[PDB]
Amino acid sequence: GGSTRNGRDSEAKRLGVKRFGGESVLAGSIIVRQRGTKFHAGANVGCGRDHTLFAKADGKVKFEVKGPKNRKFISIEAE
Amino acid sequence: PKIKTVRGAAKRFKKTGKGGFKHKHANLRHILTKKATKRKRHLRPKAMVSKGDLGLVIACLPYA
Amino acid sequence: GIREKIKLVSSAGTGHFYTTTKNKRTKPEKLELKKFDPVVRQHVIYKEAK
Amino acid sequence: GFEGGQMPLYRRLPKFGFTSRKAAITAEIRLSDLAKVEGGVVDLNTLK
RNA sequence: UUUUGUAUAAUGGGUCAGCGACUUAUAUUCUGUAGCAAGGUUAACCGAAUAGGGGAGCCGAAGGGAAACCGAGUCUUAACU
RNA sequence: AGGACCGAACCGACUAAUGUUGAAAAAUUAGCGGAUGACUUGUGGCUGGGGGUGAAAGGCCAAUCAAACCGGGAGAUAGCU
RNA sequence: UGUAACGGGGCUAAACCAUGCACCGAAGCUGCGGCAGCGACGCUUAUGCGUUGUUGGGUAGGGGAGCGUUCUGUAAGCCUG
RNA sequence: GUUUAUUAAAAACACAGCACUGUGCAAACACGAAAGUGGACGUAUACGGUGUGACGCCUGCCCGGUGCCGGAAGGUUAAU
RNA sequence: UGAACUCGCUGUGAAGAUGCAGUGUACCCGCGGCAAGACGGAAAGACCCCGUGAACCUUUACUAUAGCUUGACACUGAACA
RNA sequence: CUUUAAUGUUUGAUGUUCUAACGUUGACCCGUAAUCCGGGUUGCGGACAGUGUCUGGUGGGUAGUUUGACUGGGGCGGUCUCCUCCUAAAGAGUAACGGAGGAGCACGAAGGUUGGCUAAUCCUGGUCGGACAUCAGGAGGUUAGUGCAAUGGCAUAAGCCAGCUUGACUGCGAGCGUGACGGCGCGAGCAGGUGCGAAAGCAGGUCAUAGUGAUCCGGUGGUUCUGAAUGGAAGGGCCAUC
């Protein structure tokens, strides 16, 4: 394989930054190989098989500096 | 000379009243067991061209 | 296609087969896998791949 | 169909056959046609 | 004329006077305007003749569906959804 | 007796000066190879462009050659000056 | 290759460093004459006058609008021995 | 001797002699909508064709690979 | 053969300028010669490279065929080993 | 059901012989005291040959055509689609023939669901024991492990272990993420039915990302949508597939 081969981009993005928006549902996060390093609060679910922090009700994103470790809380609630 | 409808488009599309062309779409003829079940449940219903994707198609289909 | 695909019929044999990703190339094992028969819309036993 | 490369779009898509051949022998009328007809009966018998 | 850049020992000028290189129909989409408008238009052709006549055909006015089949509705199917 | 052999014409165009919009589509000058022969030359004719003719050179074929001349297909074709 | 590693002279201060006030310094700023466009304020609705404000170098391409040239009609007219 | 018209004039090409594979005569060989004609008015001591190279005297090895001849022992096997 | 009444050095430089900047020099026009220049005048570089271009040549690469050949067939009848 | 001969016989081949098919590079006569040629008379060959024709084989002798791209030039080597980390700039967009490892498949479990558990490594003790394996104790550890590369998570484990078990589900889908598009990735939830759990509750596989060719063609199995005069049929369309 490499060098080079490089493994170009790997589809890696940050997506959810600041208050954000969605019509009725939203992803909350997209960052891969992530389970509980960003923890679920409000109208969402914890990250697993698809790496998203998916929210089933229209909400605005709120970010905490602390959680159970590490494991900082990412809150999604209606405004 | 009377201007010809292109065979490449004429035998692949169905017309409408409001505009846009209706068609069966690809990926539903060849080796079905190897393809995803959710994908096969999404390709079973037929597809359509909307007015924003239509200019390229009437450049092959001139007539009513 | 190096997968030699198998197709089974329901307990009653009626309608079409059920095509499955279950392999026969690599291991001899039980072919009964219990699947949906859409003439009865019920989960039933499936038989004979020939 | 040419768009610089990567093939014309219609060459990716499946064919549609099975013709019906009745439209060229079918008429379409609104309620204000054949509406008087000298008091007679509307039937498609022997139009020639 | 060209080029990142040419006074360029780069391609081109000896001179007077002339020559020397872009058509519109069939089909169509949007635009402009003209006649008429849910209608508009006849082709070839007849004709006193460029008047009048010629609506076959064409486009538009109602769609959905592989098609059969339904219609301001309609397809998909066990399908209400 | 002899494709012996010297030497002109006769057939060539090897040496050096010269010419190459020339005396010239290759000869002006003096030499040089062959010089009754597998020689040359006057007259008449035969073999024809995917076809001839070469002790046969990718030589020659009427100013034209890894393929002659003419008009027509023809305003071939040119992602280019 | 020859004045030729401030272009050169002057200059042991007329160089070097930074300091204090003055002056010179564009086609622009700014004043005026003129024009087109956008918009106000005062007077007036042939429609202008008065004042203030403001934009006006534009090439691949996208829009607006004149002056000549020729034919055809005007032209049974108008100019001409 | 022959020679590449105007850039090598020869170690290039050509006759000698040798070898080999074909060819029984309506030969093999050759050009041709095909007669016909050339081979030849010739006869295997003749003729075709490819090598090598006058002369004197000579010419070691390999048949697995390539081609060709007979078989297809053994394989693979068309048409109809 | 655009305009020519075409000096040397050094700088500037599509950087190897007669011609832009500075500086040293130079009577004008001929003629018979001299020959360091005017990248002299001649050749819309020949060199090499790029090109899915064109051609020729290698060849059981792809495709078609002349000729060869088993079979089927027409001229076509009868017998025996 | 063997291997084979003769009696009978189907169909070929080689050879001989006859000649009511066809050849004569045989002669003579007439045209005509014509070494062209036809006719005429007579000999010799003979289904061999000859000429054309169709299907298979062979066959540059002849004619047309093809022979991908990158490569800080050519050439040996590297490379063209898919995974992963740094280069990569503390939004967005991202390069090199820069630094460095992999894929073109496997698994019926390493799965679903309910209930339990926790590593590495080193020393000492111990033995069928010239060196691995299983263990006991002590120090020490979310550093072991995960079907495979790499990457990060992972104990409330997604790492291994037992019961039951196959959701490695059908039909639908609001949509959510992405690239210029084709196309790629993720999917709430509804409806059908089965499975786990005492139950609240949960299951559209695997710890996630690579494991694969758009379409045209024809085949394969159902249907009764179509089907040139029309009742069947051929062929197509749908349904289900290769």
UniProtKB/Swiss-Prot annotation, chain A:
State one molecular function term (GO). tRNA binding
Residue ranges of region Disordered?
Answer: 1-14
Q: Could you tell me the Gene Ontology terms of the biological process aspect for this record?
A: assembly of large subunit precursor of preribosome; cytoplasmic translation; cytosolic ribosome assembly; positive regulation of ribosome biogenesis; regulation of cell growth; ribosomal large subunit assembly
Q: Which GO terms describe its cellular component?
A: cytoplasm; cytosolic large ribosomal subunit
Q: Which Gene3D superfamilies match?
A: 2.40.50.100
Protein keywords: Ribonucleoprotein, Ribosomal protein, RNA-binding, rRNA-binding, tRNA-binding
**What family does the database annotate?**
Belongs to the bacterial ribosomal protein bL27 family.
Oligomeric state and interaction partners are given as: Part of the 50S ribosomal subunit. Cross-links to the 23S rRNA. Cross-links to the A and P site tRNAs.
Q: What is this protein called?
A: Large ribosomal subunit protein bL27
Gene behind this protein = rpmA
From Swiss-Prot, chain B:
Q: Where is this region: Disordered?
A: 1-21
Q: Which GO terms describe its biological process?
A: cytoplasmic translation
- Highest taxon above the source species: Bacteria
Q: Which UniProt keywords apply?
A: Ribonucleoprotein, Ribosomal protein
A cellular component term (GO) from this record?
A: cytoplasm
Membrane-crossing segments per the record = none
Molecular function as annotated in GO: structural constituent of ribosome
Please give the name of this protein. Answer: Large ribosomal subunit protein bL35
Which species is this UniProt entry from? Escherichia coli (strain K12)
UniProtKB/Swiss-Prot annotation, chain C:
Tell me if Cell membrane is a UniProt keyword of this record.
no
A GO BP entry: response to antibiotic
Q: Which UniProt keywords apply?
A: Methylation, Ribonucleoprotein, Ribosomal protein, RNA-binding, tRNA-binding
Q: Name one GO molecular function term.
A: tRNA binding
Q: List the disulfide bonds.
A: none
GO CC annotations, alphabetized: cytoplasm; cytosol; cytosolic large ribosomal subunit
Specify the superkingdom: Bacteria
User: What family, per the record?
Assistant: Belongs to the bacterial ribosomal protein bL33 family.
Q: Please, what other remarks does the record include? A: Surface exposed on the 50S subunit.
Q: Give the quaternary structure.
A: Part of the 50S ribosomal subunit. Cross-links to the P and E site tRNAs.
- Protein name in UniProt: Large ribosomal subunit protein bL33
Which organism encodes this protein? Escherichia coli (strain K12)
Q: Corresponding gene?
A: rpmG
From Swiss-Prot, chain D:
| Residue ranges the record marks as coiled coil | none
- What domain of life does the UniProt record list for this protein's source? Bacteria
The role this protein plays is:
This protein binds the 5S rRNA. It is required for the late stages of subunit assembly, and is essential for 5S rRNA assembly onto the ribosome.
According to its UniProt record, which protein family does this protein belong to? Belongs to the universal ribosomal protein uL15 family.
Quote the subunit structure annotation. Part of the 50S ribosomal subunit. Contacts the 5S rRNA.
Report the protein name in the record: Large ribosomal subunit protein uL15
Organism of origin is Escherichia coli (strain K12)
Entire protein: shown range? 49 to 96 of 144
